[PDB]
Amino acid sequence: MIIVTGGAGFIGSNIVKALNDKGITDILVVDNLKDGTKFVNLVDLNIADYMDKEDFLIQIMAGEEFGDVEAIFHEGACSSTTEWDGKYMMDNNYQYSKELLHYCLEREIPFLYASSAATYGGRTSDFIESREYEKPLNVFGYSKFLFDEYVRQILPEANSQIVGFRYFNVYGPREGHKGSMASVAFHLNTQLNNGESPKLFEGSENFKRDFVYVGDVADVNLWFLENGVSGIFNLGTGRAESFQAVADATLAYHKKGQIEYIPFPDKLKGRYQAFTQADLTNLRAAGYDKPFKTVAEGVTEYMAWLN
Amino acid sequence: MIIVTGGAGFIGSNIVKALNDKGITDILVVDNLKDGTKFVNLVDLNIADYMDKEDFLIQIMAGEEFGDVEAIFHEGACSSTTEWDGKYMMDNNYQYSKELLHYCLEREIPFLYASSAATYGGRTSDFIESREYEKPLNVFGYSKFLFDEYVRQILPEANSQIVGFRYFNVYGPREGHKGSMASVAFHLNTQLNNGESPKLFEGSENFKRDFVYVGDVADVNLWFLENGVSGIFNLGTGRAESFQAVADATLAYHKKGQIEYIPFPDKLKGRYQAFTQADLTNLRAAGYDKPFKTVAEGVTEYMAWLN
Amino acid sequence: MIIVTGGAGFIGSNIVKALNDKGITDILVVDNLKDGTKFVNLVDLNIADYMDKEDFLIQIMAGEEFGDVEAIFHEGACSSTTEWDGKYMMDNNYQYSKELLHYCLEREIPFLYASSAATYGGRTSDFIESREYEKPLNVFGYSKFLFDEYVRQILPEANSQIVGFRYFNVYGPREGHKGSMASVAFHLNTQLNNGESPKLFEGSENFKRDFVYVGDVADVNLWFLENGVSGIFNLGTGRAESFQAVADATLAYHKKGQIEYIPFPDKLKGRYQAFTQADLTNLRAAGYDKPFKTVAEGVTEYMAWLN
Amino acid sequence: MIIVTGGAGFIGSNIVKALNDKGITDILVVDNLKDGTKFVNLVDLNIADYMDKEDFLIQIMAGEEFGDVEAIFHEGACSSTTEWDGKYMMDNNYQYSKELLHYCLEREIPFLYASSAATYGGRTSDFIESREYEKPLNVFGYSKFLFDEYVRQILPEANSQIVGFRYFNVYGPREGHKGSMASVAFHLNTQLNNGESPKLFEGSENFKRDFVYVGDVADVNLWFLENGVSGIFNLGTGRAESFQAVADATLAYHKKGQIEYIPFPDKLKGRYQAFTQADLTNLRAAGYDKPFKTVAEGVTEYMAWLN
Amino acid sequence: MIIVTGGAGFIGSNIVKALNDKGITDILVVDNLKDGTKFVNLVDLNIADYMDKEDFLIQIMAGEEFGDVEAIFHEGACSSTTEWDGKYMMDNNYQYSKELLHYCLEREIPFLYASSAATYGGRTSDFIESREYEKPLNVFGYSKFLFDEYVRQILPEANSQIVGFRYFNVYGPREGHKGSMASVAFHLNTQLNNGESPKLFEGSENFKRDFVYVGDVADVNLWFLENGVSGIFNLGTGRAESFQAVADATLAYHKKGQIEYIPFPDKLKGRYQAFTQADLTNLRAAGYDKPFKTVAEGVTEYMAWLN
Numbered sequence A, B, C, D, E: 001m002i003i004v005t006g007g008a009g010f011i012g013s014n015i016v017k018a019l020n021d022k023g024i025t026d027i028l029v030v031d032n033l034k035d036g037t038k039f040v041n042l043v044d045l046n047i048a049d050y051m052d053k054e055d056f057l058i059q060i061m062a063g064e065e066f067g068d069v070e071a072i073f074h075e076g077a078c079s080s081t082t083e084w085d086g087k088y089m090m091d092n093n094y095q096y097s098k099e100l101l102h103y104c105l106e107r108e109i110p111f112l113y114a115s116s117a118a119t120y121g122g123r124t125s126d127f128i129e130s131r132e133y134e135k136p137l138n139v140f141g142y143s144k145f146l147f148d149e150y151v152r153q154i155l156p157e158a159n160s161q162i163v164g165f166r167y168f169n170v171y172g173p174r175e176g177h178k179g180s181m182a183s184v185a186f187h188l189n190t191q192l193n194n195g196e197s198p199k200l201f202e203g204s205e206n207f208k209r210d211f212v213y214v215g216d217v218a219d220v221n222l223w224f225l226e227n228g229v230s231g232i233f234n235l236g237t238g239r240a241e242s243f244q245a246v247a248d249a250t251l252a253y254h255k256k257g258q259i260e261y262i263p264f265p266d267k268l269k270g271r272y273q274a275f276t277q278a279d280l281t282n283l284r285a286a287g288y289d290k291p292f293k294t295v296a297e298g299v300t301e302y303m304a305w306l307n
């Protein structure tokens, strides 16, 4: 049996699918299905059971057994970078994670969780998995950062696998529910299907991210499960590409449309990463040697799936 | 003693009536009577006691005894296909059901519950009670689907009856409270009694459902109780009929009126089943061999009862 | 010691007064004094103590002793016929009553409670205390009906007094707080003192009720306490009188005014009793043989007290 | 150690000051400081500790010790005569008081509490501390009345001091927070300092009250503590004076202004005491023989303190 | 291990930084991160863990251990002088503090907490740490005052360090979140960077405060920890300077701008301190002999850090 928190969300559901593809269906999904439209992400998948995040937490803290648990993929989190309720953020992200971590540690259950490249918080190089390089620009980022710091305290003493994946800009199938937190690829696709103009922020000529395909993210997750290695690892392609590149791949698929520039949103000024590029040294050194899909490859594959 | 959850609702109250007709009155109804107008559905019936769904759940989970329970007909659920609070849906439908199921299993109490053909989610044939054919279009459907999947895990090991009825489009007496979730028959009748025009969705020429009379649904329920067979079974006539057919039967009774087409509601686009027809192979194979009332028969009988 | 629930309400306060008149002042009143203006109903009376309905219930269910309890007059209920929250109605009326009943039963405390002729729900004769004749038109009525049904299950086995009084149209002193649930007598009086026209519903020419004076209701209550007889008994004059009769008695006292007809309120259409007349066969057979004040007598006595 | 509930309120804070003046500072104040502006009433005083009314109650009911308690002055209450939530009133005034009383009784702690002349409810003479003369005109008054009645049941059996002070119209320093429940003296003063006209109700020519200075009220309280006598005692000057008299004393101090008559407020019609005058027979008979400051004396002393 | 409550706030975060500078990183921060923007204050620091104030309190009161606690710096409080909810203020400031104090006392954990010069409440000299000189002008001040009074009762009997720092007008890095409670220095800086005019209250010519640099405040805190001395001590420079002086230092750095006078805000009239100057006699006598940065020094250092 495997547990996937955030299992009805974007990355989580993709981990579920990947597990299904390996013939594993004995999965417990933990999520918050308040936004019911998220069911789409599970409808075509095969799981054993579903539990709400709040119930799960209660049971975790009471020390309930869930049977023979092989791993927890902890993808569940408040994922909005524009959420400013720190109380909620620190409870739901940081505290929640701590609580899970301890539960796993005590039962020697492999624990594989989601960090974020938001922890790097705006810099132009050296995106390296170490405290010196970390300085989040928002409370979301802070909640992730502090957890990584917590994990770092625990690692030397741990008797079972602990892995944190520092995801960069993930995109692909099963993020339709993320609204304004959905990938630019997604937004452009839906704008184009609506006969609207595809929109980019003002200054996106100079904005670059490490855009990584969700399929690859899933593969990395399973690989680490199979291999047992511990640590905190960047997860991206290693190549930074401009938003313009993403737009290109998208318009190319749709055979139409032309980019329009909207004002840079006030609520992100000072909170924004203008450049990210994953340094994959540690990742490779851990033994994960598979290549990553480029924006051209990933976006077109995604576009096909969206239509 | 028999327990009927959703007992003040449409199908539940009809099960109560059917039990009354067999001389059984030692019934506990579990429901949520917040909408007080639902009392009409019980007023002319004979029951032993009434309990709110929330109290019932608490007692179930505490392992209270209710006396000598012969069966639970679990018809209680949030039945709105346009309810999008997934948290509520999964608690009140899925979790609730699990909780009941376990309670019954442990005491070897026959458990007969409501599934839904919404689990098939829009396809043009092969409405067969098996996972390959299931793909709900909304979270309501998902909550039903996942429970059936759960039941499927339990069945091989079960020591007492477990039956799920996959109801198609049920209509007849005691659904007045269902508002916009009430049968089209019901809506047309009340429109006509109000001197308004009888209304159908745009494109209903091509929309067909397996419309099944509530009386038959009740009979099936009791039959299964008496016969002890387990499984998940489609419950419909086996014949798909157009909404136009329903309208015909109705206008014929009222001796007046002409169909008006209203816009297809935005909130259902992408969430809608355009065709359903129950495959009754498993149902028949279980031994239930009685015929089902056609739309012509059922609707006219209903119309008489409404007036 | 005697307990009167609804003790600050109309009928309850009158039971208190009646007890006072017999030299009994060791009374605990249970009510919900949220509407503070209800204090008037107790101000001139003599009681031992006051408790809120919610606290009372908690203590009842915990099995607290209140000292040496001689009887509970259970007049407390949500008494509005236009309240449509069934959840609340069934908790506060039905469940609450059950809870009291059991408490009394276990301690062999005489339990005398309020039913309602609303249980008959609109019929033109045979207002007899038996299930065949009962069919309430609203959820208030349902909550009363179901409790009577519950009492009926308990009666054959009971070792102490259980009595339910099925009050018809009660009127008299101490109902000023009941707003639109107050007697027509009351409304007419206040309309006339305000220089307004006295108002009756459209079609009141054909509306008749068994109007019974509150003083008589109180007497019946005490009589049953003294005599120990069990059962469910109609409580009204046995004579149906038109609303016109009530108006006559009232205008006669005030020496002025002329009836005006207002529209029949939408919220009561289909929910309304057009005729009631208590069949006093069981009541008389139990041994209560005293006469009841007519509308002419009762209304004029009331009018004097109001001025 | 001494406890003063309502200690941050008008009368309570004055009791604190009086205790300070006798060299006693080991005081626990219990209040509800939601309206923070009430802190002024304590700022210049000396107390040992502060507790919220809700916490206090919890601890009382749990039977916590507070150390060596010498007395409780129970001045805490919802003091608004225009508050019509009876549920709250009866909990916070009546029930709360009962709870304290029992706590004290059990530990033989002298209990000195606040009643009110509102219990007399509008009469033109015989303001005597006995049930025949009591008939409050509002639920505030009722809550006080019923408690006095409760105390009366307890008194013959009590082994420690119980005293209730039936305050008439108290005025003086430390009532600035009472808003529209503040003394007329206070209102006139603030109207005059605002260059507005000093306002009296229409018909105040014929309205008289027993206006008593807060300083005297405090003295009475301490006297009873020192002397140990039990009972319920009127506390006022024994002389009724018109509102006009109060106005006179006030305008005289301010050397300006002329009375304006505003409409008698709707919300008080039928709820209003037109005359009060304390009968001090019992008070004197208990041994308290000190004189009371007249309106002329009291108001001018107050006016000086206000400026 | 060290605990810093209010650790994400202004003074608290500076204590954290100071601890970091001494090589201490084993810190638990307790705060309320509801306003997420406060994360900035911790982002560049090194702590062991984070806990919400409400959870912390629960655990404190349950008597949980946090490991080997060396000290608690209790800087956490509702710090707004214009918050008028006294209930909240007394719970969150006074009660909370008491609760911590007892926890520490019992485990002999050095307890170092924040008082306030607001306790002096407007006077023109003798700002001495003694009750005669204390008279707060608002409920915030009251909550601090009462706690100091409480500490004073405890001190003679205490077996471990208790220190309260009566901070005057603190200013410097990490107060950006304090909005209108932020230093005038801060406000002027942000006004100037916005091309607006730097604003001072009307009458600031005659307003002087003891402005003290946050760096010094931090030093004092650590010094007391190292030295073990107990008591309540003023913490300011000992020199009063006008707001004009602060403005001067600021405009001098920015090389531009001219002071504009805005109306004195209504909500502060009667609640305002016009003059403060710390008397450092006790502070020096305790042994703390280091000098304090003047407004000229402090403000310019701050201005550099802000830019």
Ligand SMILES: NC(=O)c1ccc[n+]([C@@H]2O[C@H](COP(=O)([O-])OP(=O)(O)OC[C@H]3O[C@@H](n4cnc5c(N)ncnc54)[C@H](OP(=O)(O)O)[C@@H]3O)[C@@H](O)[C@H]2O)c1
Binding pocket: A005, A006, A007, A008, A009, A010, A011, A012, A030, A031, A032, A038, A053, A075, A076, A077, A078, A079, A092, A093, A096, A114, A115, A116, A117, A118, A166, A167, A168, A169, A170, A171, A175, A178
């Ligand atoms: N998407 C990216 O590009 C990316 C990049 C870097 C990091 N990440 C991180 O990776 C994880 C997955 O991201 P995502 O894109 O899949 O986000 P997502 O689509 O929103 O998936 C997360 C789901 O988990 C729920 N959730 C929140 N807190 C939970 C908890 N404590 N336990 C269980 N479920 C919880 C969310 O709902 P509610 O918040 O409404 O309760 C949501 O349904 C998140 O931690 C995210 O921060 C993602």
Ligand SMILES: NC(=O)c1ccc[n+]([C@@H]2O[C@H](COP(=O)([O-])OP(=O)(O)OC[C@H]3O[C@@H](n4cnc5c(N)ncnc54)[C@H](OP(=O)(O)O)[C@@H]3O)[C@@H](O)[C@H]2O)c1
Binding pocket: B005, B006, B007, B008, B009, B010, B011, B012, B030, B031, B032, B038, B053, B075, B076, B077, B078, B079, B092, B093, B096, B114, B115, B116, B117, B166, B167, B168, B169, B170, B171, B175, B178
């Ligand atoms: N009528 C159809 O065409 C049809 C078709 C397929 C399936 N079904 C299913 O068969 C059952 C009967 O449906 P229906 O048409 O009779 O709907 P319904 O009239 O609304 O009956 C359900 C009643 O039970 C209540 N309820 C909800 N959750 C409950 C719970 N956990 N325990 C007990 N009662 C609960 C509902 O109120 P609240 O949610 O507001 O609390 C309602 O009063 C439902 O499960 C429904 O999904 C019906």
Ligand SMILES: NC(=O)c1ccc[n+]([C@@H]2O[C@H](COP(=O)([O-])OP(=O)(O)OC[C@H]3O[C@@H](n4cnc5c(N)ncnc54)[C@H](OP(=O)(O)O)[C@@H]3O)[C@@H](O)[C@H]2O)c1
Binding pocket: C005, C006, C007, C008, C009, C010, C011, C012, C030, C031, C032, C038, C053, C075, C076, C077, C078, C079, C092, C093, C096, C114, C115, C116, C117, C118, C166, C167, C168, C169, C170, C171, C175, C178
């Ligand atoms: N007067 C009539 O024409 C007549 C006729 C037939 C039957 N009855 C019945 O006689 C009883 C009293 O009637 P009434 O006219 O005297 O009504 P009433 O004036 O409204 O008095 C009832 C009082 O009891 C309170 N209450 C509600 N639930 C309670 C509970 N569980 N325990 C204790 N008190 C509770 C009510 O407040 P809240 O509900 O707001 O909390 C109200 O203050 C009711 O059951 C009523 O249905 C009266």
Ligand SMILES: NC(=O)c1ccc[n+]([C@@H]2O[C@H](COP(=O)([O-])OP(=O)(O)OC[C@H]3O[C@@H](n4cnc5c(N)ncnc54)[C@H](OP(=O)(O)O)[C@@H]3O)[C@@H](O)[C@H]2O)c1
Binding pocket: D005, D006, D007, D008, D009, D010, D011, D012, D030, D031, D032, D038, D053, D074, D075, D076, D077, D078, D079, D092, D093, D096, D114, D115, D116, D117, D166, D167, D168, D169, D170, D171, D178
């Ligand atoms: N001064 C008069 O004219 C006068 C005349 C006759 C009788 N009295 C009585 O004398 C007492 C004090 O009167 P006052 O004029 O000083 O009124 P006050 O200034 O309003 O004093 C009462 C204070 O106690 C608080 N409180 C309420 N319930 C409490 C409780 N259960 N325990 C502790 N504190 C509580 C009140 O706030 P909240 O209600 O907002 O919670 C308020 O702060 C009251 O019982 C009053 O009814 C006064």
Ligand SMILES: NC(=O)c1ccc[n+]([C@@H]2O[C@H](COP(=O)([O-])OP(=O)(O)OC[C@H]3O[C@@H](n4cnc5c(N)ncnc54)[C@H](OP(=O)(O)O)[C@@H]3O)[C@@H](O)[C@H]2O)c1
Binding pocket: E005, E006, E007, E008, E009, E010, E011, E012, E030, E031, E032, E038, E053, E075, E076, E077, E078, E079, E092, E093, E096, E114, E115, E116, E117, E118, E167, E168, E169, E170, E171, E178
């Ligand atoms: N800054 C000055 O010139 C000066 C002057 C006078 C007094 N002080 C005192 O110094 C202390 C801190 O000052 P500051 O300038 O750093 O103010 P601050 O920035 O507001 O720091 C206090 C922080 O702690 C939080 N908090 C509130 N109650 C808490 C509790 N019980 N436990 C833990 N955290 C809590 C506050 O949030 P929430 O209130 O929203 O919950 C806030 O984030 C306060 O006690 C303050 O009164 C400083």
Ligand SMILES: [N]C1=N[C]=NC2=C1N=[C]N2[C]1O[C]([C]OP([O])(=O)OP([O])([O])=O[C]2O[C]([C][O])[C]([O])[C]([O])[C]2[O])[C]([O])[C]1[O]
Binding pocket: A079, A080, A081, A116, A117, A118, A167, A168, A169, A170, A180, A181, A182, A183, A184, A187, A199, A200, A201, A204, A207, A243, A268, A271, A272, A273
């Ligand atoms: N440039 C541009 N253009 C257009 N659009 C856009 C851009 N950018 C961005 N965008 C959008 O918005 C949003 C926000 O952004 P940000 O702030 O940057 O965030 P991001 O990163 O991008 O995303 C996020 O992330 C995170 C982590 O990292 C996660 O968790 C989440 O979920 C998300 O993904 C965005 O979203 C877009 O749409």
Ligand SMILES: [N]C1=N[C]=NC2=C1N=[C]N2[C]1O[C]([C]OP([O])(=O)OP([O])([O])=O[C]2O[C]([C][O])[C]([O])[C]([O])[C]2[O])[C]([O])[C]1[O]
Binding pocket: B079, B080, B081, B116, B117, B118, B167, B168, B169, B170, B180, B181, B182, B183, B184, B187, B199, B200, B201, B204, B207, B243, B268, B272, B273
């Ligand atoms: N075509 C047409 N026309 C008209 N009308 C209509 C149509 N369709 C539909 N409709 C209406 O609306 C509503 C909704 O529907 P739906 O979404 O589709 O749903 P249904 O299926 O129909 O019904 C339902 O079902 C279910 C299952 O199956 C149940 O549960 C519920 O309750 C219901 O019944 C309807 O209702 C109509 O009215």
Ligand SMILES: [N]C1=N[C]=NC2=C1N=[C]N2[C]1O[C]([C]OP([O])(=O)OP([O])([O])=O[C]2O[C]([C][O])[C]([O])[C]([O])[C]2[O])[C]([O])[C]1[O]
Binding pocket: C079, C080, C081, C116, C117, C118, C167, C168, C169, C178, C180, C181, C182, C183, C184, C187, C199, C200, C201, C204, C207, C243, C268, C271, C272, C273
């Ligand atoms: N005819 C006429 N006119 C005028 N007014 C009136 C009439 N009728 C009636 N009314 C009024 O409204 C109300 C209501 O109605 P119902 O629903 O029917 O109610 P009833 O029965 O009469 O009364 C009631 O009752 C009950 C039981 O039986 C109780 O619980 C309640 O509380 C009441 O009493 C009436 O009220 C009148 O005012």
Ligand SMILES: [N]C1=N[C]=NC2=C1N=[C]N2[C]1O[C]([C]OP([O])(=O)OP([O])([O])=O[C]2O[C]([C][O])[C]([O])[C]([O])[C]2[O])[C]([O])[C]1[O]
Binding pocket: D079, D080, D081, D116, D117, D118, D167, D168, D169, D170, D180, D181, D182, D183, D184, D187, D199, D200, D201, D204, D207, D243, D268, D271, D272, D273
């Ligand atoms: N005459 C006159 N003029 C003017 N103003 C007035 C008068 N009277 C009165 N006022 C006013 O209003 C108020 C209230 O009144 P009442 O309702 O009457 O009340 P009193 O008695 O006066 O006072 C009260 O008391 C009580 C006890 O008894 C207490 O608790 C409260 O708090 C109060 O004090 C008055 O105040 C004035 O302003």
Ligand SMILES: Nc1ncnc2c1ncn2[C@@H]1O[C@H](COP(=O)(O)OP(=O)(O)O)[C@@H](O)[C@H]1O
Binding pocket: E081, E169, E180, E181, E182, E183, E184, E187, E199, E200, E201, E204, E207, E243, E268, E272, E273
């Ligand atoms: N003379 C002044 N000129 C401009 N702003 C002021 C002045 N005095 C106070 N303020 C602003 O108003 C706020 C509140 O002041 P006050 O209530 O005296 O608290 P404090 O003593 O903490 O400054 C301060 O944080 C500051 O931003």
